[PDB]
Design a protein around this ligand. Sequence first.
Ligand code: SF4
Length: 232
Amino acid sequence: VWEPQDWQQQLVNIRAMRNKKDAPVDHLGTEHCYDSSAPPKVRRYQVLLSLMLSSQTKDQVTAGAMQRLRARGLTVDSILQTDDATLGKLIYPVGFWRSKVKYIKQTSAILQQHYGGDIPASVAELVALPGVGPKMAHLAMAVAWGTVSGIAVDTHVHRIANRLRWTKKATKSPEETRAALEEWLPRELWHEINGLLVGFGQQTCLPVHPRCHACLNQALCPAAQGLEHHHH
Ligand code: SF4
């Protein structure tokens, strides 16, 4: 097998310097319509709802309905206790909002009775829900459960993997790093590691002259002794 020495400690340090979550790539490409303080189970329900309200709809109109639902408190119970007319005025004016009221109310009842208040964990069960198609199912599996086919390795993930030495030996291409990372990384982190490291490289682990003087892995990063610059 393989376990990068002090990776679980290096990971939570990357999470700490990332707790602000203010990097360009993620904000361009992540979803902000979820309560950050919500427990993981409530978050998964908010992910599914945000996907069911994005069929031919502006992202500002979509995020505007999420922020209105979060303002009242967005849980499976609060939705089931909301009448159809009230929920209609809330998500209005998202596209096809009348059908989406029926979709959300019925799906929330299916989750409460057959899933203990959680969302399904397979594409086949997700697409069986009213208003959930195959495109939404694969996005829900990736954002809510972290299930992805493979680790998406770009220049940032390839650079940080060789700096922290998360591979057996120094890889030569981002594709060689993918097979080395998939040897040991838990699958629930395969999707989260892309949204975390790419933003980490943009803000701290820069391609040249990284901010090792303000990085928590200064004692954990093996190659930090060669990139730390005092005059920088
Ligand atoms: S100390 Fe420097 S090289 Fe090591 S992880 Fe932090 S930014 Fe990257």
